[PDB]
Design a binder for this molecule. Sequence first.
Ligand SMILES: [Ca+2]
Ligand SMILES: [Ca+2]
Ligand SMILES: [Ca+2]
Ligand SMILES: [Ca+2]
Ligand SMILES: [Ca+2]
Lengths: 317, 317, 317, 168, 317
Amino acid sequence: ATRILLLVLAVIIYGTAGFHFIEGESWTVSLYWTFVTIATVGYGDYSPSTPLGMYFTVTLIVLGIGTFAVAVERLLEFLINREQMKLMGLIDVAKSRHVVICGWSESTLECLRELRGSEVFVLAEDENVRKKVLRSGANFVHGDPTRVSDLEKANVRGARAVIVDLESDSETIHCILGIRKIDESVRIIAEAERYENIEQLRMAGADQVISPFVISGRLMSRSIDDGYEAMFVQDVLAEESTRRMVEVPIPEGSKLEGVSVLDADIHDVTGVIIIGVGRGDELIIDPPRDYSFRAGDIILGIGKPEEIERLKNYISA
Amino acid sequence: ATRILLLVLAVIIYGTAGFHFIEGESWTVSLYWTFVTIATVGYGDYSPSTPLGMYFTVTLIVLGIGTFAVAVERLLEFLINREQMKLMGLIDVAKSRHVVICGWSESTLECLRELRGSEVFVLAEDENVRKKVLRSGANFVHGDPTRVSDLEKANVRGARAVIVDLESDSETIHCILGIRKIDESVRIIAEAERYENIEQLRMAGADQVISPFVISGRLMSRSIDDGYEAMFVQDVLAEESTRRMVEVPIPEGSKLEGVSVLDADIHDVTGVIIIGVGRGDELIIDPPRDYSFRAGDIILGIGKPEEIERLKNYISA
Amino acid sequence: ATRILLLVLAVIIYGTAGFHFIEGESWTVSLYWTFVTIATVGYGDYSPSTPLGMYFTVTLIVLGIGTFAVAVERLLEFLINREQMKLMGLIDVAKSRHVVICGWSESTLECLRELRGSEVFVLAEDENVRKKVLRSGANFVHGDPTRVSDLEKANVRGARAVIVDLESDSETIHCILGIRKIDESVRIIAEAERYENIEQLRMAGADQVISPFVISGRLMSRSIDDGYEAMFVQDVLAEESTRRMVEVPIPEGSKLEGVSVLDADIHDVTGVIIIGVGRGDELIIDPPRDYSFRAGDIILGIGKPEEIERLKNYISA
Amino acid sequence: DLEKANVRGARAVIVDLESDSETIHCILGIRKIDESVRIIAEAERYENIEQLRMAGADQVISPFVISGRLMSRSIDDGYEAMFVQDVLAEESTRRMVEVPIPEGSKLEGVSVLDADIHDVTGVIIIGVGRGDELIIDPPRDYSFRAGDIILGIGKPEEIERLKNYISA
Amino acid sequence: ATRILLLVLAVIIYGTAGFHFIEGESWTVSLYWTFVTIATVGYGDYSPSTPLGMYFTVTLIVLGIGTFAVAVERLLEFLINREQMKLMGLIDVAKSRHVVICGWSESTLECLRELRGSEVFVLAEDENVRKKVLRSGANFVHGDPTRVSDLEKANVRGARAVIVDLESDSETIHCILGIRKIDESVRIIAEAERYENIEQLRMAGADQVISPFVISGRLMSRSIDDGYEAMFVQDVLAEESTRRMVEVPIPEGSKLEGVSVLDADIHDVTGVIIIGVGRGDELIIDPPRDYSFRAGDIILGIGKPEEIERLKNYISA
Ligand SMILES: [Ca+2]
Ligand SMILES: [Ca+2]
Ligand SMILES: [Ca+2]
Ligand SMILES: [Ca+2]
Ligand SMILES: [Ca+2]
């Protein structure tokens, strides 16, 4: 570890004391000479012509070779051990604005195509998951995502948001109960599977719960006959062919703070159906006529992307 | 990444400004001197005798050692990471006249003994398949051969022909439907398993469909009693003991363009049974007497290899 | 292996005989010159101006490059083979005050949080166990823990204590019968699973047998109705919330050697319930009034941690 | 599938599954069915002892923490494991017993110093328990009731003298 | 591959033509100078003082660094790829007096403790078998031991003897039928499992067939009552506690060539029960009184190891 540096200094004390006491030169020239011959520069103006110096320089050169051989084998031991540790996980995460994804499935693959690559750390235990993440462009941290000691190696104490989707519901509930032990304030997003588990996933402490299997189960059995809601939910939320469900913020100033929805009259002006307003971690779906807009509220609406731009200038100052 | 080069230039600016302002030498000699001492050449004719220069050269040598230690550890990090990425697949293919083989079985092993080795890229997901391909002399690209994003890493946009044989029929139909999404014009060869799937494998877009299991199923149940067609199909198509089924082209000129099959009279002249002629991606099995040969057509025939040579001179000019 | 050193000396004999017989210089100056040019130092005061020497030095430099290329490839072969052997187990243990743990489960994970890390060698055969041990901070020795030849690679002939917990009872009995073949005097701790196997685990030769499954089985069926013993055993032996079960030794002198338990009267003085005294590998649970304390005996007791300190000063001199 | 076994209305439910995640999720389902049924879990890791309590189990028994701490303390000395193995598992000589105080039987209002149980019976009074809270090692300023449970350690000969001692 | 050497020579032609045409020196001194500065020796007696030479030497040094960086990365690419190929099998065997063992079980582990280590190449396809062989001290060749192309990589064309024990009988019969295709004369030893397969294992071409399962099956059902033959076969063939079954050769001369078994009278002289004589790949169990010994025959006998020595001097001349 640290012994190579003391070996370097010991050979320096050997060379200086050998030059000064045999060639009879001063201290500074002996320091300069051992620092020029230890790097094999060889200017050649302070060379020892003395035969005792002619034999002493041989030992100085051979111990210089031995020192540069033990330092190189130490560097290669450290580099090979680090690039073999880092390849199969087994590393500690040191970032602080990153996104930790526990588990790996198709639903967490579709959220990497809307994020950047080296910002996202997938924490899982399988070996095929490792090759899929290293293919897809994120980082891999080998761990058991339920165990609290394997959550702190992904550093969820300073993570931006944590997205949890594991292979069952029991492991998802346990990962959320583990995450709320470390950092109480981080934002956790989970995926439920059964219908009866959404109440447990909220009581365990998840901030946002998505449940796609009950969505498709309710959309299948109500599309046997006509299937008109399925076209809406597919065309708007999944593919975004003709529409897109947007949420736009109301910035400071912004020319309509304090008026009602009747006075602004957004649907005839722009063409965007306002669904609701999000005043601070709640949603008023279909706000009434007597709602007055504030600062920092967010209008949720559906429209073609050229109507979203016509709304984003009607709000802006 | 790029910081090592700027480190090299920074130490160059340090050494030049140290030599020119302390030894009092010109600019060009200071540039030459730092370029000779940074590589430990040491000619020794422009050496600094000044004690401030005697201490400054020590710092120049130690920072030269530090730069040559950070560049070496960067080179070793890059080389070890590249030879560990390339070993387990995980690489992008950059050739443009190569053959991509999706999947691995015995039928795709027998087509490597009729191709060259580094021309063929086997794309699969198993780990035993990796060792078998690295044994057999092709290249391995780790991917899921149904997924479109794992087909473009094998670069089927510029591949010569793609040969598809996966573990089921459903994965073969899906790989063909994926390949016809990327490059519409590439030539795809597939292997069917069930009899009812050849119509789907043609409607999905494969150019040539081979189905060996129905061939053996029809040859087994018609060889219980006598088994005479089985000897023909084995001896000609599989082992090629005494015959070989050949296809020979008609080149330009070639002394028989425009005559009929009756006027050429190939079977009595040569001894090769003409089966059919391939005028441009179709086959006329047993052409009639009134067929006239054209340029670029191909005669398909069965014969001993010394009769194929007697045909290949009867066609040539 | 050893041929590189003889190559170095052969090139030394070549360079000395080349300098002395062509430049006509003495023996010692030729030795010095080949030792300065073989390391590329180049002082430049004994340089050969002779054109035969001008061609001979080229061969000396090229063979010096060849020697420094074969030694570097030998060093890299040895270092890469050693860091690939050591990573997947496959190494021999050379310490002599270490703790060998055969097998891996949750009960042997909770004993690493009360020991140091590089003192403990986990011997197992699985591959997931390897990543869990390399995560947890111990060392991993790949072996089959029943086989006697794979026990001597973990070096149980000079180990401090061996802790055995395998996946069954049959493998635990076989590992204990294997350990008592190598070193007869080492201390073995085992974990039993079934109730009927504790007599076999003692007759095979284990020094201390723990059996947690029968403990929980007897605590479950006696906590259906009231569950008061379960609170005691949990609160004292598992969590150590308010109490802790201590064993304190009686050192030499220690102000109470020779008095009885009635004369010392530990419970009213301190508040620690004395359970028993351990005079040399036996336990007298509830010692009578007529027990006299000796030197080196150990008092086993339960109490709050500030009563254990009030006992540890009442015993001390 | 829990209402098929009718976990609503039972003496107790004993939960011991293959892992801790399924034990947590099973206790959370049993508390969705019935709020007053008595659950006894088995915790595997250490940090799941608080989670199995917060989910709602009334009694958590963690054998793996017990065994993993008795392994790392018996490397040198090894006298704690002998007491645990000879009183809780094998029951060779002694055993832990919990006996209650019946109604109007020699002891309602009696302090612990003039109870003198260790010297009239021989059983070590570890603690006294009244209504699912344990008072380990009760002090001298303490009065018994009818309905408390005395927790003690002793030979099976002495527990009979104790059960004779606390009758009417 | 080969381009680095031509790069070295191209930089040599650059340096020689640069020195000779700018410094104006001769050809040989320019060759010497580029060979001294390309290795960073730096004697310093032929240094270019010309400013065009002062700039030209910089380019010579930088291209020397570039050449020594591309050769080092080529050497590291080759060494890392070779030590990663050789670790997981994937190598061709080049010895010619070696023993190839196909498959791995307990019966082939007990024959490594009677052979040397680097003489024996275990050919198998599993991954746990790899770690067990690399533990046990032999070499591992990754292959499928039935496939003929994976038998020639273990080089059974020049192997001394091949020992075959696979996981079934069908794979053993197929490995023997594959080995007799490559080298017809090699000595093959097999292990049978079922009783009915010994005739197939001899008709396929094995030279010696051992079948331990039928041996134990016949020894179990004849040791229910008394078990006296089991003690003999165990004590003599397995453990060799008091006896050992020996085969001793009759060398040339050897003082008893031509006499009968009655005239030699080996059992009363020595105490070794002669079982049979092996005159050239056959066995005459209990030879008659009228057998005459020849040269090169081999006496098979059972005895204590001090009677085998008393026989080995009674035979010797
Ligand atoms: Ca999911
Ligand atoms: Ca197939
Ligand atoms: Ca266990
Ligand atoms: Ca359990
Ligand atoms: Ca076998």
